[PDB]
Amino acid sequence: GLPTTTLPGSGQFLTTDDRQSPSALPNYEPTPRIHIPGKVHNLLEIIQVDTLIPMNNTHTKDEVNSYLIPLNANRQNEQVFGTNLFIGDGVFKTTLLGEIVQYYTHWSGSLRFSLMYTGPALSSAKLILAYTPPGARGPQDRREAMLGTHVVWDIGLQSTIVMTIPWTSGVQFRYTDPDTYTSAGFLSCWYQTSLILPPETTGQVYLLSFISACPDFKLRLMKDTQTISQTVALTE
Amino acid sequence: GLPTTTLPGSGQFLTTDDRQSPSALPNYEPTPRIHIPGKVHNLLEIIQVDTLIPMNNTHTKDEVNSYLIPLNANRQNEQVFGTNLFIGDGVFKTTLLGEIVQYYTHWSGSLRFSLMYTGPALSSAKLILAYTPPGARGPQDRREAMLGTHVVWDIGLQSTIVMTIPWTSGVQFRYTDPDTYTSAGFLSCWYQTSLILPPETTGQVYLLSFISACPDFKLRLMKDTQTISQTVALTE
Amino acid sequence: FNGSETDVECFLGRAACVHVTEIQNKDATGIDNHREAKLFNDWKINLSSLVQLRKKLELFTYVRFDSEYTILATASQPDSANYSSNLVVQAMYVPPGAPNPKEWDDYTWQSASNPSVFFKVGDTSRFSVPYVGLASAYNCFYDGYSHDDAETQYGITVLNHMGSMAFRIVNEHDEHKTLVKIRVYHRAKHVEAWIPRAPRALPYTSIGRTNYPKNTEPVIKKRKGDIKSY
Amino acid sequence: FNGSETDVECFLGRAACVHVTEIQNKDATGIDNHREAKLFNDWKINLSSLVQLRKKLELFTYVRFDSEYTILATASQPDSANYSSNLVVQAMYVPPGAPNPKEWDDYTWQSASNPSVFFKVGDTSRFSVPYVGLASAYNCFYDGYSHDDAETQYGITVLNHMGSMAFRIVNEHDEHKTLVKIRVYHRAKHVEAWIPRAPRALPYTSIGRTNYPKNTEPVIKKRKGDIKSY
Numbered sequence A, B: 001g002l003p004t005t006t007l008p009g010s011g012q013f014l015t016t017d018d019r020q021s022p023s024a025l026p027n028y029e030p031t032p033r034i035h036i037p038g039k040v041h042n043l044l045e046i047i048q049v050d051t052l053i054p055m056n057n058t059h060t061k062d063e064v065n066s067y068l069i070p071l072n073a074n075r076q077n078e079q080v081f082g083t084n085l086f087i088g089d090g091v092f093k094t095t096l097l098g099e100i101v102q103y104y105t106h107w108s109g110s111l112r113f114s115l116m117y118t119g120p121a122l123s124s125a126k127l128i129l130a131y132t133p134p135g136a137r138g139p140q141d142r143r144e145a146m147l148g149t150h151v152v153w154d155i156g157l158q159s160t161i162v163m164t165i166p167w168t169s170g171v172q173f174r175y176t177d178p179d180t181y182t183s184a185g186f187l188s189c190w191y192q193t194s195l196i197l198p199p200e201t202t203g204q205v206y207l208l209s210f211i212s213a214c215p216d217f218k219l220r221l222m223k224d225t226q227t228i229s230q231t232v233a234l235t236e
Numbered sequence C, D: 001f002n003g004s005e006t007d008v009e010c011f012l013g014r015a016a017c018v019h020v021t022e023i024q025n026k027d028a029t030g031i032d033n034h035r036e037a038k039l040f041n042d043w044k045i046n047l048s049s050l051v052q053l054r055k056k057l058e059l060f061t062y063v064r065f066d067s068e069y070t071i072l073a074t075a076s077q078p079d080s081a082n083y084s085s086n087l088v089v090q091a092m093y094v095p096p097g098a099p100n101p102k103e104w105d106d107y108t109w110q111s112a113s114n115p116s117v118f119f120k121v122g123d124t125s126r127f128s129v130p131y132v133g134l135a136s137a138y139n140c141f142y143d144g145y146s147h148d149d150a151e152t153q154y155g156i157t158v159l160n161h162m163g164s165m166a167f168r169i170v171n172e173h174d175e176h177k178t179l180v181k182i183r184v185y186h187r188a189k190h191v192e193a194w195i196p197r198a199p200r201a202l203p204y205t206s207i208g209r210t211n212y213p214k215n216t217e218p219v220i221k222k223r224k225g226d227i228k229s230y
Helices: A096-103 A142-147 B096-103 B142-147 C008-012 D008-012
Strands: A069-071 A111-118 A127-132 A149-151 A160-165 A186-191 A205-213 B069-071 B111-118 B127-132 B149-151 B160-165 B186-191 B205-213 C016-023 C040-042 C060-064 C070-075 C089-094 C116-119 C124-126 C164-169 C180-186 C192-196 D016-023 D040-042 D060-064 D070-075 D089-094 D116-119 D124-126 D164-169 D180-186 D192-196
Touching: A096 A205, A127 A142, A127 A160, A142 A149, A142 A186, B096 B205, B127 B142, B127 B160, B142 B149, B142 B186, C008 C192, C016 C040, C016 C164, C070 C089, C070 C116, C070 C164, C089 C180, C116 C124, C164 C180, D008 D192, D016 D040, D016 D164, D070 D089, D070 D116, D070 D164, D089 D180, D116 D124, D164 D180
Parallel strands: none
Antiparallel strands: A069 A205, A111 A160, A111 A205, A127 A149, A127 A186, B069 B205, B111 B160, B111 B205, B127 B149, B127 B186, C016 C180, C040 C164, C060 C192, C070 C124, C070 C180, C089 C116, C089 C164, D016 D180, D040 D164, D060 D192, D070 D124, D070 D180, D089 D116, D089 D164
């Protein structure tokens, strides 16, 4: 009674196609839906949390000290931080933002860099931390960083320093293929003055660095995510 | 629940059939549509532009002088132009109107022949240019051209001469198969008087000839467009 | 955006190859190759095999599925030649809390209310098994044993079992060789996740037990030089 | 007229044979013929092969597609006789910015979110890949390299990559010969063009680089005699 045609692409098996399929248990009430806290609808609220950054991961075996940026006394106009802002590579790879951006593809959005001091109450220091945009060669000292968009937010009365990281569109998005190009962004910190330790301190103090994404974040295409060239078929 | 029949022509693969097909990326926002200038919706506005005609392409190697119709002094009642108006063949083949009409098939529409003089300001000449319709033998001299639909629009005060080319329907359209029949139209130019050069000029002056299609143009069926008997499967 | 790209439903709802297997049908006993991978196969479904070696689901703690197993069966023995003459394959979703076949010609292929399907080799079959969970969500990441009493097994926590797929052939006649490869693609619908969880460092070493493997290489990368970058 | 004959959408929207190829499946290694055109094939899609040797799209500068690859696969080895017994062929659209397989039994045929289809040999499959463009239009005709920095490759400009098609066979058993010919027909939908461009004189000599070939013959025709026609 109903005439119909064929379509090329018959017997097709798209893996990815959303088609309603009939039920093997057509009449079965499941265990009913209850309310449990922390309901999630999006990975944006997953990556809204400042995790931490391993910056002092320059020791061989991985320990707790991988996150402690070491601060000594009587050093000024010299290096504290320094990083390429290529998330999914280098030191940002093993953050939660790390494997999330390793999951997808081309991304967009501003960030929320945070920074926090671990030292004595009666200690003071001035730390210039500077951002240089992608496509610009990063500064070589405290001088050239100060001519950049320098941030002090000093140590001695304030511990938690947050700086937003504005995003700039390059070729419409961010390159997500493995290269060591140097146009990803650059953040680094310098002693504006020497660290003033309290008397008979005799050691080191440290900083703690966090990273996350502002609500402006964007994730566009999805990828396979090998990361180990993965194949294990072990079942029990 | 829904009874249906077959149709002969099942498993058919029409190459040319507009059928909506399911998406391999069913959920992916693309790079969004922005505005960039020169938006095109039709080939009519492509072929609305007077390009140029190579008329002095009677030299062997192709140079810049292929478009320069040569004008000498002390010649009158003799040849300047002369062409069969078979676009897609001869001297009109390598115009933009050329490969566009080589793309389609049977065509229709009036044209816009243009003509422009390249000489000194204090120079004068009378040039009769004459059109004869398709199906008529073209004139042999300035006399027989003058009894045609003669156009002077002289040289000495006016440089840019445009003449519309009216279209006449033969057997309902224009023959688009390769033959050297002589019922395609004929346009040619004659010196009504000798070219009056300025004193101690001692050389040649030239004319520049353009062609395009008026908005009355029409292109009806599409063809394969070999033009070289084309096959190259080189991929990199 | 309210677009299903970075949300949870698009995140886990893709279809992935789990449980490659290879069966045949020969005879009642015939040549002594009966038990291991021939004449039938049971899986005891567990997304613990190759959801990129348990990663995106392990990123959360509490999930709820609605599964769509799409069984792709094919004839490894040259289907182009023959070895496909009405080779009807029987799949079967044995629900949790039901006895498992361990023989090809066994009673629980035809028993009562065990959802079994039949399809041609080289074609597919689409399911929709609803959320068969003991808890209100799938406890993918659970702390606790089953009892301080008798105690079922161990803190593998197979109490929130999902099911058990069984594949076999209804055919006969040992004079010849055939071989059938069966490849099931799980797809989760209406995925509701809860309680985000920090990702693992290594690829795992066990199913169910959250053990990190010994003898590890450094999962994090050394700086290229010093804290001085570039 | 407002009829879709001479407009842009009818102009480029026809389906054309690109990328004739020829694969098979033999064994794991077997006879030493593995790598070149056997057991799999990657294309790295580029309309630069046989859109009448890049002409109608080269007539414009900026385009935007919505592609419909219709893969026609057929069994070159006599399908009339056999060599077609459930010969399931696997196609795969690897998107730009994703790793490419280089082996038949390789991890990125079954990996995560790589659109792969399965169909019978001698039948077809229809796609619709959306506009996968880095720029807002496809820069078919671009001036500039990729960087003054590291600089990706050269001014081929593979930055606006469209995709990469991969074809392979899921079958087994070296005792025999089969051969499968695969022929993909691209079709562009919703074609929006910009910035008309003067056509080429010669058939080209390179892909991406707008080079005109050396040693040329005259592309324009001499007059039959003089400026005197007829």
